[PDB]
């Protein structure tokens, strides 16, 4: 009944959904902006259409009416939002479902519940999963001071709508509480507008185990396995490892069972993840992303499952354990350990600012246990500042975590991207660290290790020789 799918996204995720649809036998429709006319995902689909004419490309990709019109004109049946652009927008999903098109995502009430941190916190408190001690919701300066007076320091200011180190910052004492609350309210009314704000009890050196959740409308809800995104630089995920090798198996099972029981109580459908803050055998619910993750590839590698393909099959209305054919919860395999590094144009010698320019040299590493999800990183590609800084993400999987570390080191040394400055030496430094290899990395590991910023000089004797030859 569904024979054509549209992807309202760009880059790596669009080609990932294109590959999943071509494996499933569906036709693919792509959307792109004028500044994204040279992107790889435009030419990887059967049909491509220009959206958001006359607008900036970021707002062009958020044009709900233009995407809806393209999906209706092209004859598409389903719409996959991917992640990061419209996969958590309630209005876009509501318009897609009201226009007669299938939305490859959770239902509208799921988006309403998990799109705000206050409502998600209330649902988790109803669900009897151990949350984190915080305030009752939108609190002012005096309400934030009452939390410090009753519970006790340290604390942390967090917005109820921000995401990715944007509306959250640390707080220690009374005056900087006022300064941070004022700056957070200013950033909320500036970037987003009409956003709430709370203050919660801070935890020293936690971990960031995430549990991937799959579920169809027939009532079957399954967790695939856990992850470990604890390697964070200023609350931004850098390296994600799955499964959490630094944790006990029974504790990981408890975390996964808590996540699947929360999703069963809510009644979750399609793909989604639950984040937990782990510190000394105490996990705390912090968020649910109603999305497919960028770091879902390591879960795909360790569980042997296709998350995007199962997502589209669930959106088709198929049964999880009968029509998709997925095994039962107790029979889900945990084979090996997988490590994902996301190579971006953030130059670590320039304060991790994104770099732009032409990519005059690209060479991807193959071999055993290597999986590549390349975005727009081919030779001759002109990097634009409008979009994300990601070039290519690469995942290495092996039976032993040390073998995965060695494979990732070989891949990072085999990668050759020239013309733009990348964070490959930073990834090499984090990989070579002894704290990462054991698996006991916390979210403060990057900011408390100045040894990761000592990058050795590279000769680069080919580019300079060619430059001298051209000059002469």
């Amino acid at each position: 009944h569904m024979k054509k799918l549209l992807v309202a996204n760009r880059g790596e995720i669009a080609v990932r959904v294109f590959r999943a649809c071509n494996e499933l036998g569906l036709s693919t429709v792509a959307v792109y902006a004028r500044e994204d006319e040279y992107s790889v995902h435009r030419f990887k689909a059967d049909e491509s259409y220009l959206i958001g004419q006359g607008k900036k490309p970021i707002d062009a990709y958020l044009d709900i009416d233009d995407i809806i019109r393209v999906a209706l004109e092209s004859g598409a049946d389903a719409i996959h939002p991917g992640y990061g652009l419209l996969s958590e927008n309630l209005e876009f999903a509501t318009k897609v479902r009201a226009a007669g098109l299938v939305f490859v995502g959770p239902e509208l009430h799921h988006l309403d519940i998990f799109g705000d941190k206050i409502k998600a916190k209330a649902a988790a408190d109803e669900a009897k999963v151990p949350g984190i001690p915080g305030t009752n919701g939108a609190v002012d300066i005096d309400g934030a001071l009452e939390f410090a007076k009753t519970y006790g320091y340290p604390v942390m200011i967090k917005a109820a709508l921000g995401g990715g180190g944007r509306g959250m910052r640390v707080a220690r004492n009374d005056a900087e509480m006022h300064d941070g609350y004022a700056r957070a309210k200013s950033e909320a009314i500036g970037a987003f507008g009409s956003g709430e704000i709370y203050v919660e009890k801070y935890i020293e050196n936690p971990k960031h185990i995430e549990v991937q959740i799959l579920g169809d409308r027939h009532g079957n809800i399954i967790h695939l396995h856990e992850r470990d995104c604890s390697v964070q630089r200023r609350n931004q995920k850098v390296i994600e490892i799955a499964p959490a090798v630094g944790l006990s198996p029974d504790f990981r099972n408890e975390i996964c069972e808590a996540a699947v029981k929360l999703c069963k109580n809510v009644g979750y459908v399609n793909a989604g993840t639950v984040e937990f803050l782990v510190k000394d055998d105490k996990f705390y619910f912090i968020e649910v992303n109603p999305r497919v993750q960028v770091e879902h590839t390591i879960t795909e590698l360790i569980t042997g499952v296709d998350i995007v393909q199962a997502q589209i099959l669930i959106a088709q209305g198929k049964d999880l354990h009968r029509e998709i054919g997925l095994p039962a919860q107790s029979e889900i395999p945990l084979l090996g350990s997988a490590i994902q590094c996301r190579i971006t144009t953030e130059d670590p010698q320039n304060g991790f600012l994104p770099d732009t320019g032409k990519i005059d040299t690209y060479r991807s590493p193959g071999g055993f246990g290597i999986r590549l999800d390349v975005g727009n990183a081919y030779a001759g590609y002109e990097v634009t500042p409008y979009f994300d800084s990601l070039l290519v993400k690469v995942c290495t999987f092996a039976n032993e975590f040390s073998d995965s570390v060695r494979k990732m080191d070989r891949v990072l040394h085999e990668f050759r991207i020239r013309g733009v400055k990348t964070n490959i030496p930073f990834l090499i430094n984090v990989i070579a660290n002894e704290n990462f290899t054991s698996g006991q990395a916390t979210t403060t590991f990057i900011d408390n290790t100045p040894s990761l910023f000592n990058f050795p000089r590279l000769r680069d004797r080919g580019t300079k020789t060619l430059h001298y030859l051209s000059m002469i």
Binding site: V29, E37, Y38, V40, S48, G380
Partner: protein, 95 residues
């Protein structure tokens, strides 16, 4: 018999109109089919692009299908070698 001859001469089974046009113009239809196998469907280009080719550092968009658009850009025209074969540096679909 002429339908079988046309099918064995063009490599695929023709329709009624192709057989009729082969009957009317035998050699012209074969030359058209040969240039169709060589240069492809040149009917989709713009008229100045069809006639005068391409300019240096020029971008064109060719609609080959509904939703398929070729982004052709010419970057460099090479010098002719000893064999007389120039090399043109194109940028088809960004690559």
């Amino acid at each position: 018999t002429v339908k079988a001859d046309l099918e064995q001469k063009i490599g695929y089974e023709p329709g009624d109109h192709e057989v009729i046009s082969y009957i009317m113009y035998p050699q012209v239809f074969l030359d058209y089919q040969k240039m169709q196998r060589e240069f492809g469907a040149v009917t989709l280009l713009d008229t100045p692009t069809f006639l005068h080719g391409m300019r240096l550092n020029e971008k064109i968009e060719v609609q080959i299908e509904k939703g398929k658009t070729l982004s052709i850009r010419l970057d460099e025209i090479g010098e002719p070698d000893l064999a007389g074969n120039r090399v043109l540096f194109f940028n088809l679909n960004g690559q």
